[PDB]
JSON list of C-alpha atoms in Angstrom, two decimals:
[
{"chain": "A", "resi": 1, "resn": "UNK", "atom": "CA", "xyz": [-3.64, -5.85, -22.73]},
{"chain": "A", "resi": 2, "resn": "UNK", "atom": "CA", "xyz": [-0.45, -4.88, -20.95]},
{"chain": "A", "resi": 3, "resn": "UNK", "atom": "CA", "xyz": [0.16, -8.56, -21.25]},
{"chain": "A", "resi": 4, "resn": "UNK", "atom": "CA", "xyz": [-0.29, -8.33, -24.71]},
{"chain": "A", "resi": 5, "resn": "UNK", "atom": "CA", "xyz": [1.98, -5.34, -25.10]},
{"chain": "A", "resi": 6, "resn": "UNK", "atom": "CA", "xyz": [4.88, -6.78, -23.07]},
{"chain": "A", "resi": 7, "resn": "UNK", "atom": "CA", "xyz": [4.40, -10.10, -24.67]},
{"chain": "A", "resi": 8, "resn": "UNK", "atom": "CA", "xyz": [4.45, -8.75, -28.12]},
{"chain": "A", "resi": 9, "resn": "UNK", "atom": "CA", "xyz": [7.24, -6.46, -27.40]},
{"chain": "A", "resi": 10, "resn": "UNK", "atom": "CA", "xyz": [9.50, -8.88, -25.81]},
{"chain": "A", "resi": 11, "resn": "UNK", "atom": "CA", "xyz": [8.91, -11.72, -28.18]},
{"chain": "A", "resi": 12, "resn": "UNK", "atom": "CA", "xyz": [9.33, -9.67, -31.36]},
{"chain": "A", "resi": 13, "resn": "UNK", "atom": "CA", "xyz": [12.26, -7.46, -30.15]},
{"chain": "A", "resi": 14, "resn": "UNK", "atom": "CA", "xyz": [14.60, -10.22, -29.03]},
{"chain": "A", "resi": 15, "resn": "UNK", "atom": "CA", "xyz": [14.85, -13.82, -30.36]},
{"chain": "A", "resi": 16, "resn": "UNK", "atom": "CA", "xyz": [18.57, -13.72, -30.75]},
{"chain": "A", "resi": 17, "resn": "UNK", "atom": "CA", "xyz": [20.94, -13.68, -27.97]},
{"chain": "A", "resi": 18, "resn": "UNK", "atom": "CA", "xyz": [24.89, -14.07, -28.07]},
{"chain": "A", "resi": 19, "resn": "UNK", "atom": "CA", "xyz": [25.86, -17.69, -28.49]},
{"chain": "A", "resi": 20, "resn": "UNK", "atom": "CA", "xyz": [29.36, -18.50, -29.45]},
{"chain": "A", "resi": 21, "resn": "UNK", "atom": "CA", "xyz": [30.65, -22.09, -28.94]},
{"chain": "A", "resi": 22, "resn": "UNK", "atom": "CA", "xyz": [34.32, -20.94, -28.83]},
{"chain": "A", "resi": 23, "resn": "UNK", "atom": "CA", "xyz": [33.74, -18.94, -25.50]},
{"chain": "A", "resi": 24, "resn": "UNK", "atom": "CA", "xyz": [32.12, -22.07, -23.99]},
{"chain": "A", "resi": 25, "resn": "UNK", "atom": "CA", "xyz": [35.41, -24.14, -24.45]},
{"chain": "A", "resi": 26, "resn": "UNK", "atom": "CA", "xyz": [37.31, -21.77, -22.36]},
{"chain": "A", "resi": 27, "resn": "UNK", "atom": "CA", "xyz": [34.99, -22.73, -19.44]},
{"chain": "A", "resi": 28, "resn": "UNK", "atom": "CA", "xyz": [35.06, -26.52, -20.13]},
{"chain": "A", "resi": 29, "resn": "UNK", "atom": "CA", "xyz": [37.55, -29.24, -19.77]},
{"chain": "A", "resi": 30, "resn": "UNK", "atom": "CA", "xyz": [39.52, -30.51, -22.67]},
{"chain": "A", "resi": 31, "resn": "UNK", "atom": "CA", "xyz": [39.40, -34.03, -24.10]},
{"chain": "A", "resi": 32, "resn": "UNK", "atom": "CA", "xyz": [42.74, -35.47, -24.55]},
{"chain": "A", "resi": 33, "resn": "UNK", "atom": "CA", "xyz": [43.65, -39.25, -25.07]},
{"chain": "A", "resi": 34, "resn": "UNK", "atom": "CA", "xyz": [45.06, -41.77, -22.50]},
{"chain": "A", "resi": 35, "resn": "UNK", "atom": "CA", "xyz": [48.82, -42.15, -22.04]},
{"chain": "A", "resi": 36, "resn": "UNK", "atom": "CA", "xyz": [50.99, -45.08, -21.24]},
{"chain": "A", "resi": 37, "resn": "UNK", "atom": "CA", "xyz": [49.35, -48.34, -22.70]},
{"chain": "A", "resi": 38, "resn": "UNK", "atom": "CA", "xyz": [52.58, -49.85, -21.45]},
{"chain": "A", "resi": 39, "resn": "UNK", "atom": "CA", "xyz": [52.78, -53.79, -21.87]},
{"chain": "A", "resi": 40, "resn": "UNK", "atom": "CA", "xyz": [53.96, -55.22, -18.46]},
{"chain": "A", "resi": 41, "resn": "UNK", "atom": "CA", "xyz": [57.75, -55.69, -17.79]},
{"chain": "A", "resi": 42, "resn": "UNK", "atom": "CA", "xyz": [58.95, -59.48, -17.68]},
{"chain": "A", "resi": 43, "resn": "UNK", "atom": "CA", "xyz": [61.20, -60.30, -14.83]},
{"chain": "A", "resi": 44, "resn": "UNK", "atom": "CA", "xyz": [62.79, -63.40, -13.15]},
{"chain": "A", "resi": 45, "resn": "UNK", "atom": "CA", "xyz": [63.41, -65.09, -16.43]},
{"chain": "A", "resi": 46, "resn": "UNK", "atom": "CA", "xyz": [65.11, -68.49, -16.26]},
{"chain": "A", "resi": 47, "resn": "UNK", "atom": "CA", "xyz": [65.81, -70.90, -13.48]},
{"chain": "A", "resi": 48, "resn": "UNK", "atom": "CA", "xyz": [68.65, -68.63, -12.51]},
{"chain": "A", "resi": 49, "resn": "UNK", "atom": "CA", "xyz": [66.39, -67.18, -9.89]},
{"chain": "A", "resi": 50, "resn": "UNK", "atom": "CA", "xyz": [65.40, -70.62, -8.66]},
{"chain": "A", "resi": 51, "resn": "UNK", "atom": "CA", "xyz": [68.72, -72.24, -8.33]},
{"chain": "A", "resi": 52, "resn": "UNK", "atom": "CA", "xyz": [69.87, -69.18, -6.49]},
{"chain": "A", "resi": 53, "resn": "UNK", "atom": "CA", "xyz": [66.70, -69.24, -4.29]},
{"chain": "A", "resi": 54, "resn": "UNK", "atom": "CA", "xyz": [67.10, -73.05, -3.39]},
{"chain": "A", "resi": 55, "resn": "UNK", "atom": "CA", "xyz": [70.54, -72.55, -2.25]},
{"chain": "A", "resi": 56, "resn": "UNK", "atom": "CA", "xyz": [70.08, -68.87, -0.74]},
{"chain": "A", "resi": 57, "resn": "UNK", "atom": "CA", "xyz": [67.73, -69.96, 2.10]},
{"chain": "A", "resi": 58, "resn": "UNK", "atom": "CA", "xyz": [69.70, -72.51, 3.97]},
{"chain": "A", "resi": 59, "resn": "UNK", "atom": "CA", "xyz": [66.46, -73.38, 5.81]},
{"chain": "A", "resi": 60, "resn": "UNK", "atom": "CA", "xyz": [64.56, -75.33, 3.12]},
{"chain": "A", "resi": 61, "resn": "UNK", "atom": "CA", "xyz": [62.89, -77.23, 5.95]},
{"chain": "A", "resi": 62, "resn": "UNK", "atom": "CA", "xyz": [63.53, -77.45, 9.58]},
{"chain": "B", "resi": 7, "resn": "UNK", "atom": "CA", "xyz": [-26.87, 2.14, 17.67]},
{"chain": "B", "resi": 8, "resn": "UNK", "atom": "CA", "xyz": [-26.22, 4.92, 15.00]},
{"chain": "B", "resi": 9, "resn": "UNK", "atom": "CA", "xyz": [-24.39, 3.76, 11.69]},
{"chain": "B", "resi": 10, "resn": "UNK", "atom": "CA", "xyz": [-20.86, 3.34, 11.06]},
{"chain": "B", "resi": 11, "resn": "UNK", "atom": "CA", "xyz": [-18.48, 2.62, 13.83]},
{"chain": "B", "resi": 12, "resn": "UNK", "atom": "CA", "xyz": [-15.22, 4.48, 13.37]},
{"chain": "B", "resi": 13, "resn": "UNK", "atom": "CA", "xyz": [-12.89, 3.80, 16.19]},
{"chain": "B", "resi": 14, "resn": "UNK", "atom": "CA", "xyz": [-10.30, 6.55, 16.17]},
{"chain": "B", "resi": 15, "resn": "UNK", "atom": "CA", "xyz": [-7.82, 8.41, 18.18]},
{"chain": "B", "resi": 16, "resn": "UNK", "atom": "CA", "xyz": [-10.45, 10.84, 19.68]},
{"chain": "B", "resi": 17, "resn": "UNK", "atom": "CA", "xyz": [-12.71, 9.55, 16.78]},
{"chain": "B", "resi": 18, "resn": "UNK", "atom": "CA", "xyz": [-14.64, 8.21, 19.94]},
{"chain": "B", "resi": 19, "resn": "UNK", "atom": "CA", "xyz": [-15.29, 11.94, 20.33]},
{"chain": "B", "resi": 20, "resn": "UNK", "atom": "CA", "xyz": [-16.74, 11.99, 16.95]},
{"chain": "B", "resi": 21, "resn": "UNK", "atom": "CA", "xyz": [-18.77, 9.03, 17.37]},
{"chain": "B", "resi": 22, "resn": "UNK", "atom": "CA", "xyz": [-20.26, 10.42, 20.58]},
{"chain": "B", "resi": 23, "resn": "UNK", "atom": "CA", "xyz": [-20.89, 13.79, 18.80]},
{"chain": "B", "resi": 24, "resn": "UNK", "atom": "CA", "xyz": [-22.61, 11.94, 16.08]},
{"chain": "B", "resi": 25, "resn": "UNK", "atom": "CA", "xyz": [-24.77, 9.80, 18.31]},
{"chain": "B", "resi": 26, "resn": "UNK", "atom": "CA", "xyz": [-25.53, 12.91, 20.61]},
{"chain": "B", "resi": 27, "resn": "UNK", "atom": "CA", "xyz": [-26.84, 14.77, 17.54]},
{"chain": "B", "resi": 28, "resn": "UNK", "atom": "CA", "xyz": [-28.81, 11.84, 16.21]},
{"chain": "B", "resi": 29, "resn": "UNK", "atom": "CA", "xyz": [-30.69, 11.97, 19.67]},
{"chain": "B", "resi": 30, "resn": "UNK", "atom": "CA", "xyz": [-31.03, 15.72, 19.37]},
{"chain": "B", "resi": 31, "resn": "UNK", "atom": "CA", "xyz": [-32.27, 14.93, 15.81]},
{"chain": "B", "resi": 32, "resn": "UNK", "atom": "CA", "xyz": [-30.47, 17.82, 14.10]},
{"chain": "B", "resi": 33, "resn": "UNK", "atom": "CA", "xyz": [-27.36, 16.53, 12.67]},
{"chain": "B", "resi": 34, "resn": "UNK", "atom": "CA", "xyz": [-27.16, 18.56, 9.59]},
{"chain": "B", "resi": 35, "resn": "UNK", "atom": "CA", "xyz": [-27.40, 21.75, 11.46]},
{"chain": "B", "resi": 36, "resn": "UNK", "atom": "CA", "xyz": [-24.69, 20.45, 13.81]},
{"chain": "B", "resi": 37, "resn": "UNK", "atom": "CA", "xyz": [-22.52, 19.57, 10.93]},
{"chain": "B", "resi": 38, "resn": "UNK", "atom": "CA", "xyz": [-23.09, 22.70, 9.19]},
{"chain": "B", "resi": 39, "resn": "UNK", "atom": "CA", "xyz": [-22.05, 24.83, 12.36]},
{"chain": "B", "resi": 40, "resn": "UNK", "atom": "CA", "xyz": [-19.07, 22.52, 12.85]},
{"chain": "B", "resi": 41, "resn": "UNK", "atom": "CA", "xyz": [-18.16, 23.05, 9.23]},
{"chain": "B", "resi": 42, "resn": "UNK", "atom": "CA", "xyz": [-18.52, 26.91, 10.03]},
{"chain": "B", "resi": 43, "resn": "UNK", "atom": "CA", "xyz": [-16.25, 27.11, 13.13]},
{"chain": "B", "resi": 44, "resn": "UNK", "atom": "CA", "xyz": [-13.81, 24.73, 11.37]},
{"chain": "B", "resi": 45, "resn": "UNK", "atom": "CA", "xyz": [-13.80, 27.18, 8.42]},
{"chain": "B", "resi": 46, "resn": "UNK", "atom": "CA", "xyz": [-13.17, 30.36, 10.61]},
{"chain": "B", "resi": 47, "resn": "UNK", "atom": "CA", "xyz": [-10.52, 28.29, 12.56]},
{"chain": "B", "resi": 48, "resn": "UNK", "atom": "CA", "xyz": [-8.96, 27.43, 9.16]},
{"chain": "B", "resi": 49, "resn": "UNK", "atom": "CA", "xyz": [-9.42, 31.06, 8.10]},
{"chain": "B", "resi": 50, "resn": "UNK", "atom": "CA", "xyz": [-7.56, 32.22, 11.17]},
{"chain": "B", "resi": 51, "resn": "UNK", "atom": "CA", "xyz": [-4.65, 30.20, 9.88]},
{"chain": "B", "resi": 52, "resn": "UNK", "atom": "CA", "xyz": [-1.80, 31.75, 11.89]},
{"chain": "B", "resi": 53, "resn": "UNK", "atom": "CA", "xyz": [-2.55, 32.60, 15.59]},
{"chain": "B", "resi": 54, "resn": "UNK", "atom": "CA", "xyz": [-5.69, 30.21, 15.48]},
{"chain": "B", "resi": 55, "resn": "UNK", "atom": "CA", "xyz": [-3.99, 27.17, 14.19]},
{"chain": "B", "resi": 56, "resn": "UNK", "atom": "CA", "xyz": [-1.00, 27.72, 16.19]},
{"chain": "B", "resi": 57, "resn": "UNK", "atom": "CA", "xyz": [-3.45, 27.91, 19.17]},
{"chain": "B", "resi": 58, "resn": "UNK", "atom": "CA", "xyz": [-4.23, 24.34, 18.31]},
{"chain": "B", "resi": 59, "resn": "UNK", "atom": "CA", "xyz": [-0.45, 23.68, 19.68]},
{"chain": "B", "resi": 60, "resn": "UNK", "atom": "CA", "xyz": [-0.43, 22.37, 23.26]},
{"chain": "B", "resi": 61, "resn": "UNK", "atom": "CA", "xyz": [1.17, 24.93, 25.46]},
{"chain": "B", "resi": 62, "resn": "UNK", "atom": "CA", "xyz": [-1.97, 26.78, 26.57]},
{"chain": "B", "resi": 63, "resn": "UNK", "atom": "CA", "xyz": [-3.24, 26.45, 30.25]},
{"chain": "B", "resi": 64, "resn": "UNK", "atom": "CA", "xyz": [-6.63, 24.72, 31.12]},
{"chain": "B", "resi": 65, "resn": "UNK", "atom": "CA", "xyz": [-7.89, 28.27, 32.01]},
{"chain": "B", "resi": 66, "resn": "UNK", "atom": "CA", "xyz": [-6.33, 29.64, 28.85]},
{"chain": "B", "resi": 67, "resn": "UNK", "atom": "CA", "xyz": [-7.75, 26.94, 26.78]},
{"chain": "B", "resi": 68, "resn": "UNK", "atom": "CA", "xyz": [-11.05, 27.57, 28.29]},
{"chain": "B", "resi": 69, "resn": "UNK", "atom": "CA", "xyz": [-10.72, 31.19, 27.36]},
{"chain": "B", "resi": 70, "resn": "UNK", "atom": "CA", "xyz": [-9.68, 30.29, 23.85]},
{"chain": "B", "resi": 71, "resn": "UNK", "atom": "CA", "xyz": [-12.96, 28.31, 23.64]},
{"chain": "B", "resi": 72, "resn": "UNK", "atom": "CA", "xyz": [-14.92, 31.15, 24.84]},
{"chain": "B", "resi": 73, "resn": "UNK", "atom": "CA", "xyz": [-13.15, 33.38, 22.37]},
{"chain": "B", "resi": 74, "resn": "UNK", "atom": "CA", "xyz": [-13.84, 30.82, 19.63]},
{"chain": "B", "resi": 75, "resn": "UNK", "atom": "CA", "xyz": [-17.42, 30.65, 20.05]},
{"chain": "B", "resi": 76, "resn": "UNK", "atom": "CA", "xyz": [-17.47, 34.38, 20.28]},
{"chain": "B", "resi": 77, "resn": "UNK", "atom": "CA", "xyz": [-15.35, 34.62, 17.29]},
{"chain": "B", "resi": 78, "resn": "UNK", "atom": "CA", "xyz": [-18.37, 34.30, 14.99]},
{"chain": "B", "resi": 79, "resn": "UNK", "atom": "CA", "xyz": [-21.05, 33.60, 17.52]},
{"chain": "B", "resi": 80, "resn": "UNK", "atom": "CA", "xyz": [-24.17, 31.62, 16.11]},
{"chain": "B", "resi": 81, "resn": "UNK", "atom": "CA", "xyz": [-23.17, 28.09, 16.48]},
{"chain": "B", "resi": 82, "resn": "UNK", "atom": "CA", "xyz": [-25.23, 24.94, 17.50]},
{"chain": "B", "resi": 83, "resn": "UNK", "atom": "CA", "xyz": [-25.24, 24.50, 21.29]},
{"chain": "B", "resi": 84, "resn": "UNK", "atom": "CA", "xyz": [-24.17, 20.75, 20.99]},
{"chain": "B", "resi": 85, "resn": "UNK", "atom": "CA", "xyz": [-21.08, 21.69, 19.30]},
{"chain": "B", "resi": 86, "resn": "UNK", "atom": "CA", "xyz": [-20.38, 24.42, 21.93]},
{"chain": "B", "resi": 87, "resn": "UNK", "atom": "CA", "xyz": [-20.73, 21.62, 24.54]},
{"chain": "B", "resi": 88, "resn": "UNK", "atom": "CA", "xyz": [-18.41, 19.59, 22.51]},
{"chain": "B", "resi": 89, "resn": "UNK", "atom": "CA", "xyz": [-16.06, 22.40, 22.29]},
{"chain": "B", "resi": 90, "resn": "UNK", "atom": "CA", "xyz": [-16.14, 22.73, 25.93]},
{"chain": "B", "resi": 91, "resn": "UNK", "atom": "CA", "xyz": [-15.65, 18.88, 26.31]},
{"chain": "B", "resi": 92, "resn": "UNK", "atom": "CA", "xyz": [-12.53, 18.89, 24.02]},
{"chain": "B", "resi": 93, "resn": "UNK", "atom": "CA", "xyz": [-11.03, 21.95, 25.92]},
{"chain": "B", "resi": 94, "resn": "UNK", "atom": "CA", "xyz": [-11.85, 20.34, 29.30]},
{"chain": "B", "resi": 95, "resn": "UNK", "atom": "CA", "xyz": [-10.30, 17.19, 28.30]},
{"chain": "B", "resi": 96, "resn": "UNK", "atom": "CA", "xyz": [-7.45, 19.38, 27.09]},
{"chain": "B", "resi": 97, "resn": "UNK", "atom": "CA", "xyz": [-7.18, 17.88, 23.75]},
{"chain": "B", "resi": 98, "resn": "UNK", "atom": "CA", "xyz": [-7.52, 19.95, 20.56]},
{"chain": "B", "resi": 99, "resn": "UNK", "atom": "CA", "xyz": [-4.74, 18.17, 18.72]},
{"chain": "B", "resi": 100, "resn": "UNK", "atom": "CA", "xyz": [-7.42, 16.31, 16.85]},
{"chain": "B", "resi": 101, "resn": "UNK", "atom": "CA", "xyz": [-10.02, 19.17, 16.50]},
{"chain": "B", "resi": 102, "resn": "UNK", "atom": "CA", "xyz": [-10.18, 19.33, 12.71]},
{"chain": "B", "resi": 103, "resn": "UNK", "atom": "CA", "xyz": [-9.60, 15.57, 12.82]},
{"chain": "B", "resi": 104, "resn": "UNK", "atom": "CA", "xyz": [-12.77, 15.24, 15.06]},
{"chain": "B", "resi": 105, "resn": "UNK", "atom": "CA", "xyz": [-14.69, 17.54, 12.50]},
{"chain": "B", "resi": 106, "resn": "UNK", "atom": "CA", "xyz": [-13.51, 15.36, 9.49]},
{"chain": "B", "resi": 107, "resn": "UNK", "atom": "CA", "xyz": [-14.59, 12.30, 11.17]},
{"chain": "B", "resi": 108, "resn": "UNK", "atom": "CA", "xyz": [-18.11, 13.72, 12.30]},
{"chain": "B", "resi": 109, "resn": "UNK", "atom": "CA", "xyz": [-18.36, 14.47, 8.48]},
{"chain": "B", "resi": 110, "resn": "UNK", "atom": "CA", "xyz": [-17.82, 10.90, 7.58]},
{"chain": "B", "resi": 111, "resn": "UNK", "atom": "CA", "xyz": [-20.26, 9.84, 10.08]},
{"chain": "B", "resi": 112, "resn": "UNK", "atom": "CA", "xyz": [-22.71, 12.35, 8.90]},
{"chain": "B", "resi": 113, "resn": "UNK", "atom": "CA", "xyz": [-22.35, 11.73, 5.27]},
{"chain": "B", "resi": 114, "resn": "UNK", "atom": "CA", "xyz": [-22.66, 8.06, 5.98]},
{"chain": "B", "resi": 115, "resn": "UNK", "atom": "CA", "xyz": [-25.98, 8.70, 7.74]},
{"chain": "B", "resi": 116, "resn": "UNK", "atom": "CA", "xyz": [-26.90, 10.80, 4.81]},
{"chain": "B", "resi": 117, "resn": "UNK", "atom": "CA", "xyz": [-25.86, 7.74, 2.68]},
{"chain": "B", "resi": 118, "resn": "UNK", "atom": "CA", "xyz": [-23.12, 9.32, 0.33]},
{"chain": "B", "resi": 119, "resn": "UNK", "atom": "CA", "xyz": [-20.24, 7.08, -0.50]},
{"chain": "B", "resi": 120, "resn": "UNK", "atom": "CA", "xyz": [-16.78, 8.16, -1.82]},
{"chain": "B", "resi": 121, "resn": "UNK", "atom": "CA", "xyz": [-14.67, 6.50, -4.24]},
{"chain": "B", "resi": 122, "resn": "UNK", "atom": "CA", "xyz": [-11.34, 7.02, -5.94]},
{"chain": "B", "resi": 123, "resn": "UNK", "atom": "CA", "xyz": [-9.96, 6.82, -9.37]},
{"chain": "B", "resi": 124, "resn": "UNK", "atom": "CA", "xyz": [-6.14, 6.98, -8.83]},
{"chain": "B", "resi": 125, "resn": "UNK", "atom": "CA", "xyz": [-4.18, 7.45, -12.11]},
{"chain": "B", "resi": 126, "resn": "UNK", "atom": "CA", "xyz": [-0.99, 9.40, -12.85]},
{"chain": "B", "resi": 127, "resn": "UNK", "atom": "CA", "xyz": [-2.62, 12.10, -14.71]},
{"chain": "B", "resi": 128, "resn": "UNK", "atom": "CA", "xyz": [-6.16, 13.78, -14.78]},
{"chain": "B", "resi": 129, "resn": "UNK", "atom": "CA", "xyz": [-8.42, 11.43, -16.85]},
{"chain": "B", "resi": 130, "resn": "UNK", "atom": "CA", "xyz": [-11.14, 12.28, -19.26]},
{"chain": "B", "resi": 131, "resn": "UNK", "atom": "CA", "xyz": [-14.51, 13.65, -17.99]},
{"chain": "B", "resi": 132, "resn": "UNK", "atom": "CA", "xyz": [-15.90, 10.79, -20.17]},
{"chain": "B", "resi": 133, "resn": "UNK", "atom": "CA", "xyz": [-14.02, 8.22, -18.03]},
{"chain": "B", "resi": 134, "resn": "UNK", "atom": "CA", "xyz": [-15.27, 10.07, -14.85]},
{"chain": "B", "resi": 135, "resn": "UNK", "atom": "CA", "xyz": [-18.76, 9.89, -15.87]},
{"chain": "B", "resi": 136, "resn": "UNK", "atom": "CA", "xyz": [-18.45, 6.33, -17.18]},
{"chain": "B", "resi": 137, "resn": "UNK", "atom": "CA", "xyz": [-17.11, 4.92, -14.14]},
{"chain": "B", "resi": 138, "resn": "UNK", "atom": "CA", "xyz": [-19.58, 6.82, -11.93]},
{"chain": "B", "resi": 139, "resn": "UNK", "atom": "CA", "xyz": [-22.27, 5.44, -14.16]},
{"chain": "B", "resi": 140, "resn": "UNK", "atom": "CA", "xyz": [-20.82, 1.84, -14.03]},
{"chain": "B", "resi": 141, "resn": "UNK", "atom": "CA", "xyz": [-20.70, 1.87, -10.26]},
{"chain": "B", "resi": 142, "resn": "UNK", "atom": "CA", "xyz": [-24.17, 3.31, -9.97]},
{"chain": "B", "resi": 143, "resn": "UNK", "atom": "CA", "xyz": [-25.34, 0.74, -12.32]},
{"chain": "B", "resi": 144, "resn": "UNK", "atom": "CA", "xyz": [-23.74, -2.10, -10.08]},
{"chain": "B", "resi": 145, "resn": "UNK", "atom": "CA", "xyz": [-24.74, -3.14, -6.67]},
{"chain": "B", "resi": 146, "resn": "UNK", "atom": "CA", "xyz": [-21.27, -1.70, -5.77]},
{"chain": "B", "resi": 147, "resn": "UNK", "atom": "CA", "xyz": [-23.18, 1.58, -5.03]},
{"chain": "B", "resi": 148, "resn": "UNK", "atom": "CA", "xyz": [-26.31, 0.08, -3.59]},
{"chain": "B", "resi": 149, "resn": "UNK", "atom": "CA", "xyz": [-28.55, 3.02, -4.16]},
{"chain": "B", "resi": 150, "resn": "UNK", "atom": "CA", "xyz": [-30.00, 4.82, -1.37]},
{"chain": "B", "resi": 151, "resn": "UNK", "atom": "CA", "xyz": [-26.38, 5.98, -1.47]},
{"chain": "B", "resi": 152, "resn": "UNK", "atom": "CA", "xyz": [-24.58, 8.14, -3.81]},
{"chain": "B", "resi": 153, "resn": "UNK", "atom": "CA", "xyz": [-20.95, 7.98, -5.03]},
{"chain": "B", "resi": 154, "resn": "UNK", "atom": "CA", "xyz": [-18.64, 11.12, -4.96]},
{"chain": "B", "resi": 155, "resn": "UNK", "atom": "CA", "xyz": [-15.95, 9.57, -7.28]},
{"chain": "B", "resi": 156, "resn": "UNK", "atom": "CA", "xyz": [-12.81, 11.58, -7.11]},
{"chain": "B", "resi": 157, "resn": "UNK", "atom": "CA", "xyz": [-9.93, 11.04, -9.50]},
{"chain": "B", "resi": 158, "resn": "UNK", "atom": "CA", "xyz": [-6.62, 11.72, -7.91]},
{"chain": "B", "resi": 159, "resn": "UNK", "atom": "CA", "xyz": [-3.26, 12.27, -9.42]},
{"chain": "B", "resi": 160, "resn": "UNK", "atom": "CA", "xyz": [-0.58, 10.02, -8.03]},
{"chain": "B", "resi": 161, "resn": "UNK", "atom": "CA", "xyz": [2.22, 9.24, -10.38]},
{"chain": "B", "resi": 162, "resn": "UNK", "atom": "CA", "xyz": [2.93, 6.30, -8.18]},
{"chain": "B", "resi": 163, "resn": "UNK", "atom": "CA", "xyz": [0.33, 4.53, -10.16]},
{"chain": "B", "resi": 164, "resn": "UNK", "atom": "CA", "xyz": [1.75, 4.95, -13.59]},
{"chain": "B", "resi": 165, "resn": "UNK", "atom": "CA", "xyz": [-1.00, 4.47, -16.11]},
{"chain": "B", "resi": 166, "resn": "UNK", "atom": "CA", "xyz": [-4.29, 2.81, -15.80]},
{"chain": "B", "resi": 167, "resn": "UNK", "atom": "CA", "xyz": [-6.68, 3.29, -12.85]},
{"chain": "B", "resi": 168, "resn": "UNK", "atom": "CA", "xyz": [-7.61, 1.74, -9.58]},
{"chain": "B", "resi": 169, "resn": "UNK", "atom": "CA", "xyz": [-11.28, 2.22, -8.52]},
{"chain": "B", "resi": 170, "resn": "UNK", "atom": "CA", "xyz": [-11.61, 2.35, -4.83]},
{"chain": "B", "resi": 171, "resn": "UNK", "atom": "CA", "xyz": [-14.81, 2.46, -2.79]},
{"chain": "B", "resi": 172, "resn": "UNK", "atom": "CA", "xyz": [-16.40, 0.51, 0.11]},
{"chain": "B", "resi": 173, "resn": "UNK", "atom": "CA", "xyz": [-12.81, -1.09, 0.60]},
{"chain": "B", "resi": 174, "resn": "UNK", "atom": "CA", "xyz": [-13.38, -2.94, -2.71]},
{"chain": "B", "resi": 175, "resn": "UNK", "atom": "CA", "xyz": [-10.94, -1.84, -5.24]},
{"chain": "B", "resi": 176, "resn": "UNK", "atom": "CA", "xyz": [-10.20, -3.16, -8.74]},
{"chain": "B", "resi": 177, "resn": "UNK", "atom": "CA", "xyz": [-6.73, -2.26, -9.71]},
{"chain": "B", "resi": 178, "resn": "UNK", "atom": "CA", "xyz": [-5.76, -2.22, -13.65]},
{"chain": "B", "resi": 179, "resn": "UNK", "atom": "CA", "xyz": [-2.86, -0.15, -13.74]},
{"chain": "B", "resi": 180, "resn": "UNK", "atom": "CA", "xyz": [0.44, -0.79, -15.79]},
{"chain": "B", "resi": 181, "resn": "UNK", "atom": "CA", "xyz": [2.64, -0.40, -12.90]},
{"chain": "B", "resi": 182, "resn": "UNK", "atom": "CA", "xyz": [0.98, -3.39, -11.05]},
{"chain": "B", "resi": 183, "resn": "UNK", "atom": "CA", "xyz": [0.63, -5.54, -14.29]},
{"chain": "B", "resi": 184, "resn": "UNK", "atom": "CA", "xyz": [4.14, -4.80, -15.09]},
{"chain": "B", "resi": 185, "resn": "UNK", "atom": "CA", "xyz": [5.28, -5.88, -11.32]},
{"chain": "B", "resi": 186, "resn": "UNK", "atom": "CA", "xyz": [3.59, -9.29, -11.85]},
{"chain": "B", "resi": 187, "resn": "UNK", "atom": "CA", "xyz": [5.04, -9.61, -15.39]},
{"chain": "B", "resi": 188, "resn": "UNK", "atom": "CA", "xyz": [8.47, -8.68, -14.33]},
{"chain": "B", "resi": 189, "resn": "UNK", "atom": "CA", "xyz": [8.23, -11.18, -11.60]},
{"chain": "B", "resi": 190, "resn": "UNK", "atom": "CA", "xyz": [7.33, -13.97, -14.08]},
{"chain": "B", "resi": 191, "resn": "UNK", "atom": "CA", "xyz": [10.21, -13.08, -16.20]},
{"chain": "B", "resi": 192, "resn": "UNK", "atom": "CA", "xyz": [12.42, -13.10, -13.19]},
{"chain": "B", "resi": 193, "resn": "UNK", "atom": "CA", "xyz": [11.05, -16.62, -12.58]}
]
């Protein structure tokens, strides 16, 4: 009765509400791509380090 | 013991009056006389309803009673003993209250029932009759009992009706339905 009146009135008279995707964007985090896929740095090239190291530590066995 | 137990604030006085007049047999006469003294109290609106205010002496209260049964003498003796009782017990702040209560007991004894059709506006006479008919038709008015159905106006109940009698109600109103509906749309 009154159930029908409200049901009818509500359903009919509102069935669109605001909904803008752009407004949503403000409220959410932005996708941005990773940075620095940097390849590892190469170090201690040559036996220069090794010859230095054999000499450098006097105690090679004591 | 006599029908309908109404425990009240000096409604024990009414109960007593009722039971007392049942044993005297003449309750209708008593009720009528009580109505008459109530009416002349009511129709002595200032300086007789203001002598229901508690400030009068015991002796002055007693003389108020003597004057009251003088005031339009020809009243049942049981309600004159009751008048004495209320004065002696120095309570008269439930005097019209006791009268109303005695009426309820009396018209219960008679069998009469009261109902109510609250609405926010006076309803059709067709409605009055139809509801009276419906209730009389149903066991709700058991018969051997009558229904004085009273439509009252209270804007509190916006639209519809609530039928009331015998502490049994059916409430189909727009306000109550709206409340439940609102709640469900607040769920």
